[PDB]
Amino acid sequence: STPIQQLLEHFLRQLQRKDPHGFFAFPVTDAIAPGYSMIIKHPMDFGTMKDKIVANEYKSVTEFKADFKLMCDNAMTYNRPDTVYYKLAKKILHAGFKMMS
Numbered sequence: 883s884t885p886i887q888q889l890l891e892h893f894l895r896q897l898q899r900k901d902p903h904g905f906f907a908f909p910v911t912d913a914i915a916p917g918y919s920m921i922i923k924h925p926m927d928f929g930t931m932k933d934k935i936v937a938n939e940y941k942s943v944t945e946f947k948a949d950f951k952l953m954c955d956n957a958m959t960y961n962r963p964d965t966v967y968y969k970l971a972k973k974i975l976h977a978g979f980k981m982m983s
């Protein structure tokens with residue numbers, strides 16, 4: 883692993899700790915979220931992020947942070963503000979960026 887891959891793995895582990903239920907661990911399926919794929923143009927999740935770190939797809943911390951923000955923004959677009967997914971996405975978006983400094 884390169885220094886960036888080691889850093890991003892550290893950030894990913896710390897971000898996933900903030901989602902103990904694993905709501906963001908895997909891609910959102912159309913079975914759980916009817917018509918999700920039709921509403922959300924660029925889906926993102928922690929699992930996909932791990933696959934991109936392993937494949938060395940992230941060339942900067944800026945790119946990784948963009949994917950994390952995407953994941954949270956998607957949940958805040960699809961879900962209504964009163965839901966657990968929306969509330970967690972908003973919470974981890976701010977906490978995650980703070981953590982990453």
Ligand SMILES: CNc1cnn(C)c(=O)c1Cl
Nearest residue numbers: 905906910914915957967
């Ligand atoms: C499993 N997590 C889920 C399920 N449904 N929806 C709509 C979501 O946004 C998330 Cl993060």
